[PDB]
Design an enzyme around this catalytic site. Structure first.
Site, PDB file in Angstrom:
ATOM      1  N   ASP A   1      14.849  17.561 -17.856  1.00  0.00           N
ATOM      2  CA  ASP A   1      14.438  18.196 -16.592  1.00  0.00           C
ATOM      3  C   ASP A   1      13.593  16.835 -16.067  1.00  0.00           C
ATOM      4  O   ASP A   1      12.323  16.941 -15.864  1.00  0.00           O
ATOM      5  CB  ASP A   1      13.593  19.374 -16.874  1.00  0.00           C
TER       6      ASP A   1
ATOM      7  N   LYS B   1      12.617  14.571 -13.067  1.00  0.00           N
ATOM      8  CA  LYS B   1      12.455  14.713 -11.484  1.00  0.00           C
ATOM      9  C   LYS B   1      11.016  14.347 -11.136  1.00  0.00           C
ATOM     10  O   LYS B   1       9.959  14.565 -11.925  1.00  0.00           O
ATOM     11  CB  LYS B   1      12.965  16.144 -11.059  1.00  0.00           C
TER      12      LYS B   1
ATOM     13  N   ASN C   1       7.672  16.526 -11.829  1.00  0.00           N
ATOM     14  CA  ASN C   1       7.239  16.560 -12.950  1.00  0.00           C
ATOM     15  C   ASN C   1       6.908  15.380 -13.881  1.00  0.00           C
ATOM     16  O   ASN C   1       7.034  15.506 -14.961  1.00  0.00           O
ATOM     17  CB  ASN C   1       8.277  17.638 -13.879  1.00  0.00           C
TER      18      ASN C   1
ATOM     19  N   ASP D   1       6.226  18.917 -18.504  1.00  0.00           N
ATOM     20  CA  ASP D   1       7.356  20.025 -18.338  1.00  0.00           C
ATOM     21  C   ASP D   1       8.524  19.590 -19.367  1.00  0.00           C
ATOM     22  O   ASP D   1       9.648  19.458 -19.022  1.00  0.00           O
ATOM     23  CB  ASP D   1       7.838  20.379 -17.186  1.00  0.00           C
TER      24      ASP D   1
ATOM     25  N   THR E   1      17.558  20.684 -13.113  1.00  0.00           N
ATOM     26  CA  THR E   1      17.276  20.885 -11.789  1.00  0.00           C
ATOM     27  C   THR E   1      18.345  20.524 -10.767  1.00  0.00           C
ATOM     28  O   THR E   1      19.092  19.490 -11.200  1.00  0.00           O
ATOM     29  CB  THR E   1      16.065  20.008 -11.495  1.00  0.00           C
TER      30      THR E   1
HETATM   31  N1  LIG Z   1      -1.529  18.024 -17.605  1.00  0.00           N
HETATM   32  C1  LIG Z   1      -1.800  18.322 -16.235  1.00  0.00           C
HETATM   33  N2  LIG Z   1      -2.641  18.016 -15.409  1.00  0.00           N
HETATM   34  C2  LIG Z   1      -2.809  18.485 -14.139  1.00  0.00           C
HETATM   35  N3  LIG Z   1      -1.891  19.023 -13.577  1.00  0.00           N
HETATM   36  C3  LIG Z   1      -0.709  19.552 -14.299  1.00  0.00           C
HETATM   37  C4  LIG Z   1      -0.684  19.136 -15.742  1.00  0.00           C
HETATM   38  N4  LIG Z   1       0.554  19.745 -16.219  1.00  0.00           N
HETATM   39  C5  LIG Z   1       1.071  20.516 -15.271  1.00  0.00           C
HETATM   40  N5  LIG Z   1       0.383  20.382 -14.084  1.00  0.00           N
HETATM   41  C6  LIG Z   1       0.561  21.117 -12.877  1.00  0.00           C
HETATM   42  O1  LIG Z   1       0.948  22.661 -13.048  1.00  0.00           O
HETATM   43  C7  LIG Z   1       2.384  22.504 -12.564  1.00  0.00           C
HETATM   44  C8  LIG Z   1       2.992  23.736 -13.546  1.00  0.00           C
HETATM   45  O2  LIG Z   1       3.368  23.049 -14.904  1.00  0.00           O
HETATM   46  P1  LIG Z   1       5.091  22.886 -15.176  1.00  0.00           P
HETATM   47  O3  LIG Z   1       5.083  22.481 -16.635  1.00  0.00           O
HETATM   48  O4  LIG Z   1       5.636  22.277 -13.965  1.00  0.00           O
HETATM   49  O5  LIG Z   1       5.501  24.451 -15.265  1.00  0.00           O
HETATM   50  P2  LIG Z   1       7.035  24.754 -15.776  1.00  0.00           P
HETATM   51  O6  LIG Z   1       6.795  24.686 -17.555  1.00  0.00           O
HETATM   52  O7  LIG Z   1       7.225  26.238 -15.382  1.00  0.00           O
HETATM   53  O8  LIG Z   1       7.967  23.896 -15.263  1.00  0.00           O
HETATM   54  C9  LIG Z   1       2.995  21.123 -12.704  1.00  0.00           C
HETATM   55  O9  LIG Z   1       4.134  21.340 -11.863  1.00  0.00           O
HETATM   56  C10 LIG Z   1       1.804  20.469 -12.286  1.00  0.00           C
HETATM   57  O10 LIG Z   1       1.848  20.369 -10.868  1.00  0.00           O
HETATM   58 MG   LIG Z   2       8.351  24.957 -18.487  1.00  0.00          MG
HETATM   59 MG   LIG Z   3       7.840  22.309 -13.465  1.00  0.00          MG
END
Ligand SMILES: Nc1ncnc2c1ncn2[C@@H]1O[C@H](COP(=O)(O)OP(=O)(O)O)[C@@H](O)[C@H]1O
Ligand SMILES: [Mg+2]
Ligand SMILES: [Mg+2]
Ligand SMILES: Nc1ncnc2c1ncn2[C@@H]1O[C@H](COP(=O)(O)OP(=O)(O)O)[C@@H](O)[C@H]1O
Ligand SMILES: [Br-]
Ligand SMILES: [Br-]
Ligand SMILES: [Br-]
Ligand SMILES: [Br-]
Ligand SMILES: [Br-]
Ligand SMILES: [Mg+2]
Ligand SMILES: [Mg+2]
Lengths: 487, 461
Positions: free
Chosen positions: B266, B268, B271, B284, B304
């Site tokens: 994943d 991109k 993330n 992610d 994605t």
């Molecule tokens: N360590 C972090 N610090 C700041 N923001 C974060 C961090 N991790 C994630 N985020 C924000 O929160 C969002 C949600 O996490 P994400 O891993 O993208 O969800 P998913 O697991 O559903 O893809 C991310 O796209 C990012 O914008």
């Molecule tokens: Mg996830």
């Molecule tokens: Mg995400």
């Protein structure tokens, strides 16, 4: 600090401590209060843990209060009442029990509190300390101590004096570099003169008692030639010499010095008399003087530890013209024979001559005995009315009406008017400055060794002694160098 | 540093360490080299004992050499070669290896320094107070530190199953990201298998280009994850040195994953998060996949749209090469502000079929390498490394050594002023096996970082 011998003093790994953990007797009173490194490590613990914080600082400030100079004392006490006793205060001791707490808001001492505080620290916090790294380090040091430190570790560098069975040397502990006296007793010459029973009593006494007014036995070992004893060095010579060989024309000490030197000799005698021992050989020439100007008694070789639940003991032995009449007769006598000698010493100190005897009339034991058992003491015009009264008290014949040891103390002696300019508290402390600091200018053959002798020699050659070793270690600052965690 | 929760961090008595002495796996490589406080205590020991004196300083000066700025490096090396019959001469070093130093990289010298230190001196250290203190710390670590110890103070972003919060570790006061996954909303949307893979991965891998899992627990409502905060490349688009630099890290992060047999799957811009210092880390991992013990390649459709590589889109045996393809799409979208195959503002089967002058001749040649279809002729992971990627001309103004280090200035610092479900044992049993708890290395870091390790590892004040 000789590099090779210093590098020997190194802490052991924790696996070499099993044996000690069991073999060691050490519990609280001994470990954390009596032994220098144990007290050190125990307080390092109390310090690093926040809960005990106040109890440690209260424990410290009481100590500092007890050795505080008179004119500060009451100020410090006020400050101490604030820091640790004030209710709802910063370092307020809560564990202290109401009765004891409100007692210490009255007073000229803080003696309940030291009991109250150590009673606490020895109960639970001690148990916390036993289950801690500090305790393990404490063993680490108890081990290093127990390692062999014989005649290798001592450089003999000067002759302090001649003794009965060999020369007393001045010597340096090659590793830490601390100057000691090294009393060497020739093995063959002891046996030949049948002196085992003596030499040993001395070893046993000096190592058993710890007091600033007695010489302190640090180490004790054998060589293939001699039995050595390492003990608190006493450069300053001895009281006998410092009457007759300081200002030869103007002989003897002034009254403040005579009193001060008696003061210590008394304190040293008390210590011995509290532990049921009779010195038996008190006289100026065996009362040594240190570099600082203070004195300590010495030559315990004819001492005698009264037996467990023994009121009085028999035996004829001592120095001519110092032996008390009740002894000279040969009856049940006790400590009162020493105090008699004390008086002879305080007489000879001031007068530069023995009480009963003139100068240059050396005579018979039966003659001097009559001069002791039946003679009135003449006191010259050099005496003060206080000194005259003191000596008379000590120099009486009847031991049930002679000034000395009473009911566990000498306080009946200490109150005597002669001791005006004296802070007994500080005398026992060390603070009190002395008035005078010093500055001074083969065999026959026949006895061969058997198995039955050597077993004594080893029982004599005990080795290094706990407290005085631990002192030297801290003194010389090797304990600092070694007790390190994060440089 | 909240006084009440800070005062909970207190070293235990030595009797409460028996269990750990046996229960802990910890041997040398792990204890003294890999774990922060272990490394610390092991060094404090080596330092306090004179015999090891030189080996510790050689060991330290090599580290300092490796993280030394180019223009100092050769100077330090000469000084290090200095420090036979010398003052702190290492005698234990074996003649053959001793020569090497002269006949020039001190990578294999360190490998023979540690070979020694781990042998006997380590055994001395195991029989020392410092090792006992080491357990004391391992115990404090193992104590429970759940949702109580974390104050949620801001919203970093919205995620699939709940809001990612910014939070502070009440006790030591370290800022973390708190990714909260709602228990019911996971179950309903059948996300366990994912959410877990992510926890497993983030806590398993430790690298400066991947987010680091610090803590992981549950609440009665959510499954939380505490991880290296990152106050994203997608937003920060909508120059070439920056694009390269950001790729450089993303490559280094990908390598670490590819050396441990995992496919990120994943990749991109959106993330790939950015920290306050200006560095990036990938994120992610929920759709990642750890290739199995002795597994060349794996199947599976997931990813994605417009980032998924063709060999995957078809549905065949694929490997790490699917990630590198995405990497290229990221590097393209970074510079161009638009996807490669797709225009701005324009089906899965259509884009699948589908799978400027702003570029330099180096960038164009890099992208084309990553953006090819055939994975046996695509630039990526080869024979245990990416060095074949690193030598590519696009990485001129790059000191890979320092990139892995942390030294290199980031070409841009950011702006600091910017229902219907029921549970059974089978669920709860998972939720506990998800809520693993505090993680060794990152915890031990936090403790040293925030300087509570100093405040606690005291002997004589
Ligand atoms: N360590 C972090 N610090 C700041 N923001 C974060 C961090 N991790 C994630 N985020 C924000 O929160 C969002 C949600 O996490 P994400 O891993 O993208 O969800 P998913 O697991 O559903 O893809 C991310 O796209 C990012 O914008
Ligand atoms: Mg996830
Ligand atoms: Mg995400
Ligand atoms: N600790 C010491 N410090 C300095 N000199 C000492 C010490 N011990 C003994 N001496 C000196 O050595 C002499 C002999 O010692 P001593 O123990 O009195 O021998 P003995 O036990 O044979 O009577 C003493 O007169 C004294 O001058
Ligand atoms: Br401890
Ligand atoms: Br000297
Ligand atoms: Br006389
Ligand atoms: Br140690
Ligand atoms: Br320290
Ligand atoms: Mg003598
Ligand atoms: Mg004698």
């Amino acid at each position: 600090r000789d590099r090779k011998y210093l590098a020997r003093l190194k802490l052991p790994p924790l696996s070499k401590c099993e044996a000690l953990r069991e073999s060691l007797d050490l519990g609280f009173e001994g470990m954390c209060l009596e032994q220098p490194i144990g007290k050190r490590l125990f307080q390092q613990f109390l310090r690093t843990h926040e809960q005990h914080g106040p109890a440690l600082q209260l424990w410290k400030d009481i100590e500092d209060y007890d050795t505080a100079d008179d004119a500060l004392r009451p100020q410090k006490a006020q400050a101490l009442r604030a820091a640790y006793l004030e209710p709802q205060a910063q370092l307020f001791c809560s564990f202290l029990d109401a009765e004891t707490v409100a007692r210490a808001r009255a007073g000229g001492l803080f003696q309940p509190l030291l009991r109250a505080v150590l009673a606490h620290l020895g109960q639970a916090p001690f148990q916390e300390f036993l289950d801690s790294l500090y305790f393990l380090r404490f063993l680490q040091w108890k081990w290093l101590e127990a390692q062999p430190m014989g005649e290798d570790w001592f450089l003999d560098f000067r002759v302090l004096g001649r003794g009965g069975f060999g020369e007393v040397f001045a010597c340096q502990m090659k590793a830490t570099g601390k100057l000691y006296a090294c009393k060497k007793l020739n093995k063959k010459r002891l046996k030949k003169r049948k002196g085992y029973q003596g030499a040993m009593v001395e070893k046993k006494i000096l190592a058993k008692v710890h007091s600033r007014f007695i010489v302190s036995l640090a180490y004790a070992f054998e060589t293939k030639t001699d039995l050595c004893l390492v003990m608190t060095i006493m450069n300053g010579g001895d009281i006998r010499y410092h009457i007759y060989n300081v200002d030869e024309d103007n002989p003897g000490f002034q009254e403040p010095r005579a009193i001060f030197y008696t003061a210590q000799i008394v304190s040293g005698l008390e210590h011995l008399h509290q532990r049921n021992i009779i010195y038996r050989d008190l006289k100026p020439e065996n009362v040594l003087l240190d570099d600082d100007g203070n004195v300590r008694i010495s030559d315990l070789g004819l001492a005698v530890e009264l037996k467990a639940g023994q009121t009085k003991t028999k035996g004829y032995a001592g120095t001519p013209g110092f032996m008390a009449p009740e002894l000279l007769l040969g009856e049940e006598y006790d400590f009162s024979v020493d105090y008699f000698a004390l008086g002879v010493t305080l007489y000879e100190m001031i007068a530069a001559r023995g009480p009963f005897r003139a100068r240059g009339e050396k005579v018979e034991n039966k003659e001097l005995k009559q001069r002791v058992l039946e003679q009135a003491v003449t006191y010259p015009d050099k005496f003060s009315p206080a000194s005259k009264d003191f000596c008379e008290a000590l120099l009486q014949k009847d031991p049930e009406k002679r000034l000395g040891f009473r009911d566990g103390s000498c306080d009946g002696l200490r109150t005597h008017p002669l001791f005006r300019d004296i802070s007994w508290r500080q005398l026992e402390a060390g603070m009190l400055t002395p008035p005078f600091v010093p500055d001074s200018r083969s065999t026959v053959k026949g006895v061969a060794f058997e198995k039955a002798d050597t077993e004594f020699f080893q029982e004599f050659a005990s080795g290094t002694c706990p407290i005085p070793w631990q002192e030297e270690m801290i003194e010389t600052g090797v304990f600092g160098d070694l007790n390190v965690w994060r440089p």
